[PDB]
Structures are given as structure tokens and as C-alpha cells.
Amino acid sequence: MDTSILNLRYESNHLIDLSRYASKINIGSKVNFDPIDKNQIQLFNLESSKIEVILKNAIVYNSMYENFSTSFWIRIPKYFNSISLNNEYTIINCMENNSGWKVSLNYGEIIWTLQDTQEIKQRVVFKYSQMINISDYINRWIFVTITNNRLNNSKIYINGRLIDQKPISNLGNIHASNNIMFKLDGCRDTHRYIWIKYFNLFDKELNEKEIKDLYDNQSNSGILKDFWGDYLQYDKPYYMLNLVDPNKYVDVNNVGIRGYMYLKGPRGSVMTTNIYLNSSLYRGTKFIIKKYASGNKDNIVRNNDRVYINVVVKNKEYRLATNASQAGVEKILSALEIPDVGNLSQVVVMKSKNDQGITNKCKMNLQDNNGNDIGFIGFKQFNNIAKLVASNWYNRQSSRTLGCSWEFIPVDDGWGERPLQ
Ligand SMILES: CC(=O)N[C@H]1[C@H](O[C@@H]2[C@H](O)[C@@H](O)[C@H](O[C@H]3[C@H](O)[C@@H](O)[C@H](O)O[C@@H]3CO)O[C@@H]2CO)O[C@H](CO)[C@H](O)[C@@H]1O[C@@H]1O[C@H](CO)[C@H](O)[C@H](O)[C@H]1O
């Protein structure tokens, strides 16, 4: 039982339809594909930055009663300018002669619109704030699912969860376009772009289980993610965020075995008046993940990869390490001269999943040199200083949010902050 009417995927050297219908795909000259993952497609605010799918005539939506759904991932750069404030722009267009469906965006909004041949319309909308300290949505990959049941509602899901639903049983015949245009249409911000991936159309209303499964399956959950949702990489400098203490950042008081890594504050804020106000993300000692036991030639960090962690202090690389030999649960982490690590413990097991199954935010399980767990890396308040530690206390704990959850943040043009140093 195959409900896919379009499944747009990058294979070999081409974007192609992997559905049974084999619709034709025309790509403009200014479409960018991410080298690390060519399924990630960047569309600028330019006439030539477009992808047009010409649908088989027989699968064009033209009905009073047929249910259908769409799914895709999107990464939306922060809105930077007041010209975006009240400017709805189409991004995925299947409207013709004022009937059909489309996906549009606006300041802090993702919008679905349906319209019948008598111009009766209904919309469902996801809204997100740009005035939030740490956003789950701004410039981070979002999984969108929209379902349409002609007997009752359109529904919009975000990361597998229902956000909005609205009645559409009053709409009559909807006759959509023969082509789907992926293109910024009516956007007045000349600098705007989006990233998109994994666009699908389905000839049914997807149920909650199907949507959750699709989210889980397209998540690439064997691969660790950076803060934006891209693949976490080796050899790439990252700023660290601890989710349980998000107003602080990592620093090293002094390099060497008598120093320690710790959380210090304030992070401070980035703002453009009445457009955004967020915590500064480009703060503290950068981490670089290094290959240790990975067999893959590529630069991708996978679940259970055994690695080293380097830390950058005054533009020079040091090794994250601890002495595991004294009794005591928490092992304070230091930044060591790489040539002088000696018999200190440094091997880290990178985790994208809680157990074989359940996906968690990044964790780093430090090993001793006999291969026993020293514990997940987090932090411990030693009176007035929160020092970074590895601690098996974390390993024994529920599935609540703990101090061992981290995000890895690289500099990205959709965020727009300037690195201070
Ligand atoms: C709440 C707390 O401190 N939890 C610790 C845990 O501490 C245990 C025990 O819970 C605690 O009551 C006791 O604290 C007493 C102290 O030892 C005495 O010297 C003092 O006179 O009075 C204190 C209160 O009676 O200490 C115990 C440990 O010696 O110990 C575990 C390790 O087994 C953890 O350290 C736990 O704190 C967690 O540590 C985590 C990292 O491992 C992480 O940082 C968590 O933030 C933190 O909750």
C-alpha cells in the first residue's frame, strides 16, 4: 500500500521523483545543493533559484472529496529587516486560477492555504517568536506535515506534533496547478532564502502514527546533529550550549592539568530592535571533534562513534581530558597540551540515542583507558563554580532533561551574529 504521489530526492547527480509516477523535475540555474547532504536545497530570492515539478496530468489534484497530505523539512533564516514584518510570500506553489494549495511564509510564520474554484479559502498556521532566548525554530530544521481531510479539517504538524487545525468541509471543488513551483514568490526581502529537503505528497490524510514514523525515519537518527539540525561533523569548530544552564557558556580558567573547564556568564543577547531579541550563541571555548575509531572516510559524526574532543583556547587546540584514578564520582575536565596527555583519559563515545531506539540531544560518554565508562559529560556546582565533569551519576538516572545535554553551534549565515573574537 503506497500512498506516495511525489517523493523528491537527490540521487547520483540529479533531483528525481522516487514515486511510481516519475513526474518531471526542472531545476533553475541558481539552486544550491549542500555538498555534505545534497538533499538539502537552498532557494534564494532570485528568478533563477527555483525548482518546478511538472505533475503527471492524472495525479493533479482536482476533487471535492480526495484526501491528501504533504511533508517536508525547512530551515528558515532569522528575519533581520522590518521589510519582512507584514509580507506573506509563497514558497511552494500549486495554485492556478485562484484554486489549489500553497505553502507560504511570513515573519515568524509557516502558512498552508487551500482554495476552491469559488475562491473559498482556509488556512492553518504555525507561529514562532523571534523574541525568545533560545528558539527551537529560528534557522533550525523543522519537520512540517500538513494533512487534509475533505470531510473535516486541514491540520499542520511541526516535528510530529499537532499545532493547528481548521475546518475545510465547506470548500467545494479544488483544482490545483499541473505544476508545483518551489520558488520565493512575492518576498520583498531581497536577501531572503530558505533551505528545504525531502518534499513528499501523499494521496491520503496521514494519521498520527504515520506522521511520527515519517519524522523518526527522515530524522537520520544514527547521525548526530548540530544545533541547526545539520549533520554533526569532525574537524569543525563549534560553540557549546548546555540546555539546562543556557545563560552560560564554556570557558577554561587555565590550560593544563591544574586548570579546569567551567560554565561562565552572562551569554548576553543579540538584537535588532522590534525584529529579534535572542541569546548570543557565539560565546566561549570552541570544541572540535576528532576521529579516533571511526571507520568512515567522510566527516560525519555517527551514533556510538568513539572520538577525541579538542578545545580551542587563544586560537590553539588542547585536548579534553581527566585523571580517572582518584575515587569520587565526578571527574573534573581539563584542557591539556596534546603532546602531554600521557595516560589521562580522553576517549568519548558520542550518543544521538538514549538506548538502542530512543533519540536524545547530544551526549558525550567519557571512557577510561581500560574502556570503562567514566560517565556523561555535564557539570557540577562546586560551591560557586560550575566545573565541567564526567560523571556516572548521569548514566544511572528517568528520561528528563539533565546537565549532560549539549548542543554544538557552528557559525551560520541564517543566524547573523558576529563572532566577538
Ligand atoms: C543534592 C546533591 O548534592 N546531590 C549529589 C549527591 O550528593 C550526595 C547526597 O545527596 C547529599 O545529601 C550529600 O550532601 C551533603 C554533603 O555530602 C555533606 O558534606 C554536607 O554536610 O551536607 C550535604 C547535604 O546533607 O552528598 C552526597 C555525595 O557525597 O552525590 C551525587 C554523586 O553520588 C551527585 O554529586 C549529586 O549531585 C549531582 O551531581 C551531578 C553530577 O554527578 C550533577 O552536577 C547534578 O547537578 C547534581 O545534582
Author numbering: 874 to 1270, 1274 to 1297
Text lifted from the article:
Botulinum neurotoxins are the causative agents of botulism, a lethal paralytic disease, but are also one of the most commonly used therapeutics for the treatment of numerous neuromuscular conditions. These toxins recognise motor nerve terminals with high specificity and affinity by using a dual binding mechanism involving gangliosides and protein receptors. The ganglioside-binding site is a pocket built around the strictly conserved SxWY motif on the carboxy-terminal end of BoNT/A14. Three HCA mutants, Y1117V, H1253K, and Y1117V/H1253K were characterised using ganglioside-binding assays and X-ray crystallography.
